[PDB]
Design a protein around this ligand. Sequence first.
Ligand SMILES: Nc1ncnc2c1ncn2[C@@H]1O[C@H](COP(=O)(O)OP(=O)(O)OC[C@H]2O[C@@H](O)[C@H](O)[C@@H]2O)[C@@H](O)[C@H]1O
Length: 172
Amino acid sequence: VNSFSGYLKLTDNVYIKNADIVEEAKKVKPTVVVNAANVYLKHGGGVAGALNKATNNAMQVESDDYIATNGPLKVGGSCVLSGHNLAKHCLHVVGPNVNKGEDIQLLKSAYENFNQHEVLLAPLLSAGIFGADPIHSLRVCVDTVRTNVYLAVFDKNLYDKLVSSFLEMKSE
Ligand SMILES: Nc1ncnc2c1ncn2[C@@H]1O[C@H](COP(=O)(O)OP(=O)(O)OC[C@H]2O[C@@H](O)[C@H](O)[C@@H]2O)[C@@H](O)[C@H]1O
């Protein structure tokens, strides 16, 4: 498990790779794969749909059951559910939907959830359907997460831009 390979080390604990998170999970067999969720755990586009489809919809059914008994998450909150065939666990984390005006500062709260796990395979929260700047999401990740986070960025152009922008933010 957790056999990550081919990552660029950004900081002592943050790593990045140009890869699809679903194919990484199959290769790596992680203890925790992170889902970029919404508060009702209705898995639409982006990472949530890809993960769910790879579980043959098991993750959506499990999520419906979780909501029925526990109610919705808060923005910036999380829950641990099964990883099914992709990982031991899936950490469903709700970043702010800044397309809908939600507080971008809640992205720190979202990434703080990573600190409850030794090692995680993760995407950049809020940077897709939720419309946050991917560079900003990476900055919050680097400044917030103290545990080992392996980030999967599937788009090669975005990967290159993120590395490049990281170098500027780091050299000040
Ligand atoms: N298969 C993938 N592999 C790696 N990265 C991916 C993949 N799919 C998307 N990404 C990237 O991961 C980042 C996160 O984007 P989203 O998955 O859209 O997550 P988010 O912006 O937080 O929006 C969450 C919302 O989208 C719905 O899927 C979900 O149900 C929730 O309502 C983006 O940079 C996005 O381009």
